[PDB]
Amino acid sequence: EIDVFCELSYRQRAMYQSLRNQISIMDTLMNLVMQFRKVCNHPDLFERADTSSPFF
DNA sequence: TGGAGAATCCCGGTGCCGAGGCCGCTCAATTGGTCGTAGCAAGCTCTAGCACCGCTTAAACGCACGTACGCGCTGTCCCCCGCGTTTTAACCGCCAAGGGGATTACTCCCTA
């Protein structure tokens, strides 16, 4: 059994920390631990990156 | 009237498939007892439904009389039927999708 640690990429931690900011109001925690598990898997699960352009 | 042909009947054969009957279970109908009530029986009031009389007039009705409208009769046509050809898409089969819902998993926190 080999443990393989890797840190949250800058996009993931932008998701994770703004999500964790909800703990300043709630604590829904069982909802948050599923959103935290999504971003810990891939942020496209939480918000799919897609072709984008400036504000019109 | 006759006739030909096209349309409908009837008779027998075939098949399939659904109705009628059988079997398990269950759960919902029945037995037995309690308790509340509700509506059934008496009694009182007096409300308004019925009957009658007399007057008023305005609504009904019998009949005169016309003319306005119902209907049969003629002509036209046009437009809907009937039947043959062309075309389309309804019906059937088979696979696909997914989409919804109920069960199961596991944390977190309310509430008893």
Side-chain angles (χ1 to χ4, degrees):
Chain A
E1 292 204 68
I2 301 188
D3 207 339
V4 181
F5 301 101
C6 198
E7 292 69 31
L8 294 185
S9 181
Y10 68 88
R11 191 183 175 217
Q12 284 173 303
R13 75 187 184 255
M15 304 294 88
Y16 199 111
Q17 200 62 233
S18 62
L19 180 63
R20 202 186 73 94
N21 188 49
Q22 304 307 322
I23 301 176
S24 72
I25 300 172
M26 311 309 298
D27 183 11
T28 289
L29 176 61
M30 190 54 177
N31 166 283
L32 295 176
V33 303
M34 198 59 69
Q35 302 203 54
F36 292 132
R37 287 169 81 183
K38 286 173 190 173
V39 311
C40 293
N41 280 24
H42 199 296
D44 284 342
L45 299 177
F46 176 49
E47 294 191 326
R48 181 61 184 238
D50 195 15
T51 178
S52 68
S53 73
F55 175 65
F56 175 65

